């Protein structure tokens, strides 16, 4: 909520599309990520108190999932490469500066 910077979209359906299932997403996780934190977990998503133990079972889930990219993808189905500029705005040295006059 305190991030100062970017969110920027563009269609990579013109490029990233194939069949590319390497593209992936976290469909479910048990909390929100901390500021700028990532969740790398390939761990089993555990729905019941029955431990899955690294195999599939009743409501045994791998939480991360993939987007099948269908080269007929439309505006709702197109991937958007998206970028976000982290910065604190002020209170630290100029790293990215402005083009000074």
């Amino acid at each position: 909520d305190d991030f100062t910077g970017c969110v920027i979209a563009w269609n990579s359906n013109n490029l990233d599309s194939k069949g590319n299932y390497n593209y992936l997403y976290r469909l479910f996780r048990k909390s929100n990520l901390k500021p700028f934190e990532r969740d790398i977990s390939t761990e089993i998503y555990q729905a019941g108190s029955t431990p899955c133990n690294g195999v599939e079972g009743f409501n045994c889930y791998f939480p991360l999932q993939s987007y099948g990219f269908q080269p007929t993808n439309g505006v709702g189905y197109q991937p958007y490469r998206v970028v976000v500029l982290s910065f604190e705005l002020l209170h630290a040295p100029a790293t990215v500066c402005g083009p000074k006059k």
Epitope: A9, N11, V75, Y80
Partner: antibody, heavy 119, light 106 residues
């Protein structure tokens, strides 16, 4: 369904105009607002989009008024502050209801705000 | 990432007119058509380049092929014609058509 703008603003060039887009008839927080400029007898020109929940003000770079789109969530009113006014900024400024998801439709708008920037 | 329209089209009632929206380089399969009456807020005719917002005449259609997006009107009425706009989708600035004033003769 209802977007009502502050009336015409006549300034000297270099001065500042801020224009109110007052939402009613729908949910403000569920819709971005597009801000659309029509120079008199000229085409539709889109200065930026704003977010109700955030400072979601993108700016087109064709002209530059040091513009910032502020949305007042209590009154559901997005402002467009257009500074560094120029005689060409003279135009009818529409605000346009935008989707909140990344789909961009402006179905319904303000009534337009003429600004005459001149000495 | 800028789009091109024909400045003017003159047609007769019942005749079919097609106004093009021609975007440079890549195009986005969404587009938005607007009928601006003189001195009046343009109104969105065509959404996604394939659909009408509700209440808009069935003679108002839209499309795209290659880099062009058409504003296609079938069977005009002398009430219908007006200034027409297309709006680029995505690619940063929604770059609105230069506008097309439609005339209907007869």
């Amino acid at each position: 369904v209802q977007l009502v703008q502050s009336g015409a603003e006549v300034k000297k060039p270099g001065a500042t105009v801020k224009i109110s887009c007052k939402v009613s008839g729908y949910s403000f927080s569920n819709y971005y607002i597009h801000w659309v400029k029509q120079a008199p007898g000229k085409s539709l020109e889109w200065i930026g989009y704003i977010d109700p929940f955030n400072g979601g003000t993108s700016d087109n770079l064709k002209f530059k008024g040091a513009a910032t789109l502020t949305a007042d969530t209590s009154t559901d009113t997005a402002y467009m502050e257009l500074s560094s006014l120029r005689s060409e900024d003279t135009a009818v400024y529409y605000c346009a209801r935008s989707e909140y998801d990344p789909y961009y439709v402006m179905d319904y708008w303000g009534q337009g705000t003429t600004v005459t920037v001149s000495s | 990432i800028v789009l091109t329209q024909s400045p003017f089209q003159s047609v007769s009632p019942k005749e079919k007119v097609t106004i093009t929206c021609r975007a440079s380089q890549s195009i986005s399969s969404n587009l938005h058509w607007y009928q601006q009456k003189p001195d009046q807020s343009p109104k969105l005719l065509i959404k996604y380049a394939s659909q009408s917002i509700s209440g808009i005449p069935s003679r108002f259609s839209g499309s795209g092929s290659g880099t062009d997006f058409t504003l296609t009107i079938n069977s005009l009425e002398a009430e219908d014609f007006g200034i027409y706009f297309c709006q680029q989708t995505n690619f940063w600035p929604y770059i609105f058509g230069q506008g097309t004033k439609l005339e209907i003769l007869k």
